[PDB]
Design a protein around this ligand. Structure first.
Ligand SMILES: CCCCCCCCCCCCCCCCCC(=O)OC[C@H](COP(=O)([O-])OCC[N+](C)(C)C)OC(=O)CCCCCCCCCCCCCCCCC
Ligand SMILES: CCCCCCCCCCCCCCCCCC(=O)OC[C@H](COP(=O)([O-])OCC[N+](C)(C)C)OC(=O)CCCCCCCCCCCCCCCCC
Ligand SMILES: CCCCCCCCCCCCCCCCCC(=O)OC[C@H](COP(=O)([O-])OCC[N+](C)(C)C)OC(=O)CCCCCCCCCCCCCCCCC
Ligand SMILES: CCCCCCCCCCCCCCCCCC(=O)OC[C@H](COP(=O)([O-])OCC[N+](C)(C)C)OC(=O)CCCCCCCCCCCCCCCCC
Ligand SMILES: O=P(O)(O)O[C@H]1[C@@H](OP(=O)(O)O)[C@@H](OP(=O)(O)O)[C@@H](OP(=O)(O)O)[C@@H](OP(=O)(O)O)[C@H]1OP(=O)(O)O
Ligand SMILES: Cn1c(=O)c2c(ncn2CC(=O)Nc2nc(-c3ccc(N=[N+]=N)cc3)cs2)n(C)c1=O
Ligand SMILES: Cn1c(=O)c2c(ncn2CC(=O)Nc2nc(-c3ccc(N=[N+]=N)cc3)cs2)n(C)c1=O
Ligand SMILES: *[C@@H]1O[C@H](CO)[C@@H](O[C@@H]2O[C@H](CO)[C@@H](O)[C@H](O)[C@H]2NC(C)=O)[C@H](O)[C@H]1NC(C)=O
Ligand SMILES: *[C@@H]1O[C@H](CO)[C@@H](O)[C@H](O)[C@H]1NC(C)=O
Ligand SMILES: [Ca+2]
Lengths: 479, 247
């Protein structure tokens, strides 16, 4: 290949629109690909491919899919240094994002008739093939950081601000008025007396909550699969209750209803804030772990809610004269509370027994032992083991999942921004001053390929030897 | 930081050696000094080899725990601010900050079901009974069960990862200790105390990868030899004599 390139050989496609680079990639010929890369004419070799072909795509995507160790060299070619002295401050590294851009750029014609390329093509190709060693290369890291500081940070701080604009005045209202008291824009109704100090803050916060609820209703009606999501339910509850909490801005309302809606709103607000936090990378793996553990726990209540029924309905009969067990529902809630080890042995079992107040002493003490064995020991250890397994499984894929979250974030953001804006904020390179403020499988695969080549050569040799025997001269050693 | 705090507070604890001082300030500085002294002693202990891997484990677990408070401090806010509204007539929940501290204390399983929920309910002293009992169930599920099991799983993973490299890390600590000590002692002293040999009387008071690598090398040598042989055979064919079997 090097000899044929040194002479001016043409670079064309065939009947399958495959160039020689596609054939070298599909057969995992590493050395010829490295030769094509290290040479001149690499630019035309890169440009020669053609769209519309579901089998021979852009050379970069194919190189990511088949020979990632060559893509690593291709990326190493994109880090330029200055004085090559780590101590110098004018020593700066430049990163070039030449090969991560859209394939529709390489071709000169670019018809784009039926060809639509998704944003961040190279990084998505790396994610869909688990090329974690490529996603950690400094060029890709700087590419993602550039996208972030270019528009992602801003597009998400706007969302956080739009939510906090209703989240913060709610909390300010709660911790500044005594629960149970009626209040309107004029002040606090102390039943009638009217406390009027701090009325300005109260009015401002009541207006800011109302506007946020209205805009949330409008946005959600605009989005209206919908009822299936959980965020939709949470936000519907938040807006419906927050609009009632501050309703005395217009129409009177009983204080009981007002504060019983405030108690739900102030809880679901801060519970929904976690779904906003799960975007950022330093603190979004904990939300994944929390969700996994919560799902695993909820899938087992369909089973381990009959243990509670058994024990609660038996304790309702055995200990019926005591207040905690004086009703079926209260007796089931007390048994749920005793699940963590708070059994009240001395208050519910020993002291009534020494007063001759247990109707069934032997059964009551046998139930205590069987409960202690079954629920605070066996069931809780089962849950702990399940959680340990789930967290290990999540940690096994932490880095790839963390990077894929960011890639998907920016990919989704690109499909909604205007074209001219992306043109304006995008960059082609970056400059950095440092001073200023799975292997065993690959090995055995390679040696399998080597063994197959060995077999092929040995068979050719065997044929040659048989030819020798059938052509030679035999005179003195004839029979 | 630890040593700055220790010295600043220890100098105030014993200041009446020169200038008078109120007893309240003296003992409130003593309470901080006597705590940070014994907390800083562990950083001295972490050098010795028989007991320095536990400090590594402690540090790893503590860092992992502190990286998640930026998240799981909003669960506490949610539950504390809702309990402040639902159970406001009770002393443990009579203020936002007290209500957030009580919720932090209830994280280990000390919920006070009979004292805060059942007995006020049987006296008709709960303002919102159904909501108060629903919050109890959701809290019990979310925090003493899910969150604590999450923390336990994280700790198990971290400790396994630390134990995977225990021996190498243990030896590297000693090597680095002595290396740093050598760069500061005087030359003649190192000459004086160094030895060249030692005498001991006993009586007196990752493999699979290496294997496949070796066999890869063997396979490459095999290929090279086979190619040389193929060339020799082609030479034989192009030099031999052919007379009776000609076409
Ligand atoms: C009858 C009652 C039935 C209750 C059923 C509860 C199901 C909860 C499921 C949670 C879940 O799946 O989370 C996933 C979520 C993540 O959801 P998600 O983002 O994965 O959702 C799907 C999105 N895709 C498809 C992209 C993956 O994990 C979390 O950590 C969520 C945190 C907030 C959860 C808030 C739940 C509150 C429930 C409270 C119930 C009791 C209230 C009592 C009244 C209080 C009054 C003060
Ligand atoms: C998978 C589950 C495995 C665990 C199974 C657990 C259940 C079986 C074991 C139960 C052990 C606890 C038994 C407590 C008996 C009463 C204790 C007591 O009051 O002691 C002082 C009193 C003192 O009594 P006294 O001497 O004042 O005379 C009255 O003991 C008794 O009242 C009776 C003596 C003990 C009798 C034990 C009988 C055990 C029967 C077990 C099966 C029941 C069905
Ligand atoms: C506002 C308050 C903010 C508090 C923040 C605390 C952060 C703690 C981080 C600990 C850590 O990283 O340890 C690493 C340490 C090890 O540090 P290290 O040695 O790894 O440090 C870096 C060194 N290199 C780079 C070589 C690795 O692990 C330990 O086990 C430390 C044990 C002692 C820690 C003492 C912390 C005390 C904090 C108390 C706070 C509350 C006091 C209240 C008042 C009491 C009055 C009586
Ligand atoms: C991810 C989270 C998953 C878990 C979600 C947990 C929340 C949903 C389940 C709540 C279960 C506990 C409900 C307790 C209700 C009151 C208990 C009580 O006082 O019982 C005796 C009393 C006895 O009442 P009475 O008969 O004296 O009449 C008054 O029961 C009641 O007061 C009413 C009967 C029970 C009503 C249950 C309604 C459940 C509503 C759930 C959603 C709420 C929002
Ligand atoms: O032609 P090279 O780039 O020098 O690489 C090949 C070989 O390539 P494969 O991995 O595709 O079989 C290995 O290269 P690396 O994996 O190390 O990059 C090998 O490695 P070992 O020597 O460790 O066995 C050795 O390359 P290198 O000497 O760079 O390590 C060898 O080439 P040579 O045997 O001719 O040196
Ligand atoms: C999604 N993503 C990154 O996060 C990222 C990144 N490169 C670096 N980071 C880290 C970062 O910017 N972290 C940030 N954390 C917050 C934050 C945290 C807690 C809050 N709680 N409150 N209030 C509020 C805000 C803001 S910026 N790239 C490329 C990326 O794609
Ligand atoms: C760092 N190192 C070793 O430790 C080592 C070693 N060879 C053996 N050892 C073990 C050893 O000497 N252990 C020791 N432990 C203490 C100690 C422990 C607890 C204390 N608590 N108090 N008070 C106070 C002192 C003193 S000597 N080599 C080569 C080394 O480099
Ligand atoms: C906010 O609530 C207060 C308390 O009820 C309202 O003030 C009362 O208004 C009525 C009607 O004008 C008077 O008859 C009462 O004497 C007022 N109470 C007091 C204590 O002065 C006030 O009108 C409410 N504000 C709004 C905007 O509805
Ligand atoms: C006004 O509020 C105080 C406590 O804030 C209360 O003691 C007093 O009874 C209230 N006044 C009336 C008329 O209810
Ligand atoms: Ca929504």
């Amino acid at each position: 290949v090097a000899l044929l390139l040194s002479h001016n050989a043409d670079i064309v496609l065939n009947k399958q629109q495959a160039s020689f680079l596609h054939l070298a990639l599909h057969n995992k010929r590493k050395e010829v690909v490295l030769t094509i890369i290290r040479s001149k004419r690499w630019d035309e070799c890169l440009k020669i491919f053609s769209h519309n072909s579901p089998g021979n795509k852009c050379p970069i995507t194919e190189m990511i899919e088949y020979l990632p160790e060559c893509m690593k060299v291709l990326l190493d070619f994109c880090m330029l240094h200055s004085t090559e002295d780590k101590s110098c401050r004018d020593y700066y590294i430049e990163y070039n994002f030449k090969y991560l851009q859209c394939p529709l750029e390489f071709t000169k014609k670019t018809p784009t008739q039926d060809v639509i390329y998704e944003p961040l093509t190279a990084l998505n190709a790396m994610v869909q093939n688990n090329r974690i060693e490529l996603l950690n290369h400094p060029v890709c890291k700087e590419y993602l950081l550039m996208k972030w500081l270019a528009y992602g940070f801003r597009a998400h701080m706007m969302n956080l601000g739009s939510y906090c604009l209703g989240l913060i005045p709610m909390t300010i209202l709660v911790v500044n008025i005594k629960p149970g008291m009626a209040f309107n824009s004029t002040g606090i109704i102390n039943e009638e007396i009217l406390d009027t100090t701090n009325s300005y803050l109260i009015k401002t916060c009541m207006i800011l909550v109302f506007l946020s609820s209205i805009f949330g209703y409008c946005k959600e009606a605009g989005q209206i699969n919908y009822f299936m999501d959980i965020s939709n339910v949470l936000e519907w509850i938040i807006y419906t209750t927050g609009i009632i909490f501050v309703l005395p801005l217009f129409v009177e309302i009983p204080a009981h209803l007002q504060w019983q809606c405030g108690a739900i709103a102030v809880y679901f607000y801060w519970m929904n804030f976690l779904l906003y936090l799960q975007r950022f990378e330093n603190c979004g793996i904990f939300i994944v772990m929390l969700e996994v553990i919560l799902k695993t726990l909820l899938r087992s209540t369909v089973v381990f809610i009959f243990l509670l029924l058994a024990f609660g309905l038996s304790f309702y009969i055995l200990l019926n004269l005591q207040d905690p067990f004086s009703s079926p529902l209260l007796s089931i809630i007390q048994t749920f509370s005793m699940m963590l080890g708070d059994i009240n042995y001395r208050e519910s079992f020993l002291e009534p027994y020494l007063r001759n107040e247990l109707a069934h002493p032997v059964l009551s003490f046998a139930q205590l032992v069987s409960f202690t064995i079954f629920v605070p020991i066996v069931l809780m250890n089962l849950l702990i083991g399940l959680a340990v397994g789930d967290i290990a499984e999540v940690q096994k894929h932490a880095s790839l999942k963390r990077i894929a979250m960011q890639v998907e974030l920016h990919t989704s953001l690109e499909k909604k921004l205007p074209l001219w804006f992306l043109r304006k904020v995008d960059q082609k390179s970056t400059i950095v001053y440092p001073n200023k403020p799975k292997s065993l499988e690959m090995e055995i695969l390679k040696q399998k390929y080597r063994l197959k080549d060995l077999t092929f050569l040995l068979e050719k040799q065997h044929e040659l030897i048989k030819l020798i025997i059938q052509k030679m001269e035999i005179i003195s050693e004839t029979e």
